[PDB]
């Protein structure tokens, strides 16, 4: 009866050629955990915490220089009310996987200075699982908040498996079981990241080209969750990303797997078109939820240039 | 039984290049980070170059940065160190080393080494190779007598000295060579024999200088 | 930098502690009894001991310091130890800490060797002095030609400390021209050491015997 949609395109420059970006909202502001690992005679590996200011990315800290890691780690960032918890884990090759996992933890309560200490998850739960980096937040389960590190099986029991920490990332002793009955043999999962919205657990992952899949989980008992596929398939459109605005899903799509244009659907009703022809596509377009009625759609059309679409959506019946 | 056999070292031309090779065995080569450590004359240990288990990460000391390449063949269980544009500062004993980890952390390279090679001397010099001159050290009396060999004016290191073709073992002392002002090394090997066994037993030192291909056996006899 | 003491001394039976600082990461401890002679890992990964190393050797790490502990130190442990670790994303080793385990003082038996005829016909002359099975390593060899104190014409060298009895042996070499050798008659080697009450002089007269 009353629907409002407002979109704003903007451009942010970046002096660092990040291999991968990792956006996060802290105190209503945009940040990025930038991995800089460009191969060269004088190029070193860095992991920068950056902050979007005006039309630029401001480099604040380099977390890698405070660690002992030689190469690219798995980054798991957990954001609370005013806290930031970043873990840089050693990417151990499947064949040469040792029984314990060494991570370098970082804690901050201002978004400026970080305490750092190396941690070791002894006899860790995800030895037989593949990990992928993501930004996340607390999940409340038995009147208790947990950070989650989830892995996936490569290709009979527990394809998805999570490690949890109720002490702000100090110890990863807790084991959260995930029951996905539509698991398949002969297929592989990739880039599995949990999507947490209003204390509901969901997962965004690739299946394989690779196709995005989205599952919705419900808490069964103890630390077990039962998940089922959430169909977002659209004919002549390729599923890209899922987020929630106004207690409803907002879903992004590509025209084909080349991503000349991107479509954003609101509650599977209204849609907006993202055409990357103002300056070259929308590959890797990712949602960044700011609040219940505000969110961002970010992609990098060219090297160092960030197209940030700011989306406002509401129903005022 | 982990074994790290080093090769490809010795006398090198200043400005030229070297190719050290460490053939490993007795462990799963593909799992661990390997590296080279060197020790200059009278100096301590300096880490030269390191390489991840899968060869996807390398590291180099500033003194070799720009003129070095550490590579590995997990299929042949080998680690190679190339050192281009050699300097007199690279004259040292080089050691192949095995780390107790994959090399995913910098402390794996020099804080987790669990196997050391015997070492290979590398001399970066423009001097010519010279065979030694072996002189006897004749056995002055008590219950025990000392006799020996003086291995003088050779270059470069090393020299191997045995007694009676490996038969004589206890009481032998091969002293570390000294570098003379001439730029040539001089060494001595002594052995303590019974004061009675003089004149009855024959004592011969077997000196072998592999760089000049000189093998000299010298019969030390008293008077 | 990685920092460890230059030296540490101990009496046999005591507990020894060598500390290395500068890194918050994994410490390694390497024993080398002789330069050029390959190190032996005593402890690696802070506190891991290879099976073939004696149980007296232990490792520890507190804060940004690693400590090597030898409980009931033996005479054989006298060696230079190097710590290994990363130093701000740089692979590194400390300067070495030379440990000395004070076993009983043993005085050297001294031998003197005249130059061979073979060397003399060649043109040079080398008189050798041998100091055998002594402790501690520290000794002074003084050469005298016709009672005249020689200087700048000799070089000495010590063997690796014996694995079994923990003694040393030193070889000093006096080099003279064949002409200078034949000018003088009495060649002496004077040995000053802790074990001895007074310098032992071993000598010979050229052409004798
Ligand atoms: Ca590792
Ligand atoms: Ca390690």
Author numbering:
A (entry chain A): 31 to 185, 192 to 244, 250 to 320, 325 to 362
B (entry chain B): 20 to 158, 163 to 246
C (entry chain C): 23 to 231
Lines from the paper:
Each member of this complex is highly conserved, essential for erythrocyte invasion, and capable of inducing cross-strain neutralizing antibodies. The leading blood-stage malaria vaccine candidate, CyRPA, is essential for invasion of Plasmodium falciparum into human erythrocytes. Here, we describe a panel of monoclonal antibodies (mAbs) that target CyRPA and that achieve greater parasite neutralization than other anti-CyRPA mAbs reported to date.
We observed two spheres of electron density within the interface between Cy.004 and CyRPA, whose size and shape were characteristic of metal ions. The coordinating side chains present “hard” ligands with low polarizability, suggesting divalent cations Mg2+ and Ca2+ are the ions most likely to bind to these sites. The most abundant ion identified was calcium, with ~0.9 calcium atoms per complex. As one of the two metal ions mediates interactions between Cy.004 and CyRPA, we measured the affinity of binding using SPR, either in the absence of divalent cations or in the presence of 1 mM CaCl2 or 1 mM MgCl2. The addition of Ca2+ resulted in a >2500-fold decrease in dissociation constant (1.2×10−9 M with CaCl2 compared to 3.1×10−6 M without) resulting in comparable affinity to c12 and 8A7. Only a ~13-fold improvement in affinity was seen in the presence of 1 mM MgCl2 (2.4 × 10−7 M), supporting the likely identification of the bound ion as Ca2+.
